[PDB]
Design an enzyme around this catalytic site. Structure first.
Site, PDB file in Angstrom:
ATOM      1  N   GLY A  30       0.837  -1.194   0.000  1.00  0.00           N
ATOM      2  CA  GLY A  30       0.000   0.000   0.000  1.00  0.00           C
ATOM      3  C   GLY A  30       0.865   1.234   0.000  1.00  0.00           C
ATOM      4  O   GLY A  30       0.929   1.981  -0.987  1.00  0.00           O
ATOM      5  N   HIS A  85       6.937  -6.300  -6.376  1.00  0.00           N
ATOM      6  CA  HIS A  85       6.030  -5.457  -7.134  1.00  0.00           C
ATOM      7  C   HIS A  85       6.533  -4.046  -7.407  1.00  0.00           C
ATOM      8  O   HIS A  85       6.254  -3.492  -8.464  1.00  0.00           O
ATOM      9  CB  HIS A  85       4.729  -5.362  -6.355  1.00  0.00           C
ATOM     10  CG  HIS A  85       3.602  -4.783  -7.124  1.00  0.00           C
ATOM     11  ND1 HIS A  85       2.962  -3.630  -6.733  1.00  0.00           N
ATOM     12  CD2 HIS A  85       2.986  -5.198  -8.254  1.00  0.00           C
ATOM     13  CE1 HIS A  85       1.998  -3.355  -7.592  1.00  0.00           C
ATOM     14  NE2 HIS A  85       1.994  -4.288  -8.529  1.00  0.00           N
ATOM     15  N   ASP A 126       0.989  -6.654 -11.805  1.00  0.00           N
ATOM     16  CA  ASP A 126      -0.178  -6.592 -10.925  1.00  0.00           C
ATOM     17  C   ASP A 126      -0.756  -7.962 -10.668  1.00  0.00           C
ATOM     18  O   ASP A 126      -1.139  -8.262  -9.554  1.00  0.00           O
ATOM     19  CB  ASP A 126      -1.249  -5.641 -11.470  1.00  0.00           C
ATOM     20  CG  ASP A 126      -0.847  -4.177 -11.349  1.00  0.00           C
ATOM     21  OD1 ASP A 126       0.300  -3.914 -10.941  1.00  0.00           O
ATOM     22  OD2 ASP A 126      -1.672  -3.293 -11.658  1.00  0.00           O
TER      23      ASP A 126
END
Lengths: 122, 122
Positions: free
Chosen positions: A29, A47, A89
């Site tokens: 996040g 990621h 993703d």
């Protein structure tokens, strides 16, 4: 974009993307990169490494299309950079589901600046 | 109940259970069984027989608990009736996903209903 990111993560994990991985660990996040704290924090790490190498389209903002076919995230056939974006993703949502075993609310904190170390380089 | 059913269909298929199968063919989202028009129709035909045998449970209204685990619907324990009820729904969510290749909005009763022949004995 994250709008597609959220849809992926909810579809893979079943969990609410914002509520669960909003502020989790040192990746997760949040903005920027740190030494992971657990394996979910590790997914989110890879990621951002992944996002970094993309340097043509705004990974964090620009949109693409995927399909939820036969319970799977199959990327649409966008452009060279948008495809890897989709791909990155997909990986994290896949990665996150696989690690639900070890997910621990602990690493959200109470919800205050945690002890994050400099990340290992990509 | 229709709450859980709806959730399963969406989860497996990725569509609004009301838009897509709200009233479809002879047996989806409508009342009674009839000789099915397509493969999607035969899902909901089979599904209604599963209900026929459900005495001791208000299929249409009996809250149960299931979970989404490694991208699969795992039904909570509960009583045999409710277990069975949960099964029926899973299998229909699944059968539906399986037969999207031939979903034919032509049969979307809501655009001109469909003349339906008499069903076989479940």
């Amino acid at each position: 974009s994250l709008v597609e990111l959220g849809k992926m993560i909810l579809q893979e994990t079943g969990k609410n993307p914002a509520k669960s991985y909003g502020a989790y660990g040192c990746n997760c996040g949040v903005l920027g990169r740190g030494k992971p704290k657990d394996a979910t924090d590790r997914c989110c790490y890879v990621h951002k490494c992944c996002y970094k190498k993309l340097t043509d389209c705004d990974p964090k903002k620009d949109r693409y299309s995927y399909s939820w076919k036969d319970k799977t995230i199959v990327c649409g056939e966008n452009n060279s950079c948008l495809k890897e974006l989709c791909e990155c993703d997909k990986a994290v949502a896949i990665c996150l589901r696989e690690n639900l075993d070890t997910y621990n609310k602990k690493y959200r904190n109470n919800h205050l600046k945690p002890f994050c170390k400099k990340a290992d380089p990509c």
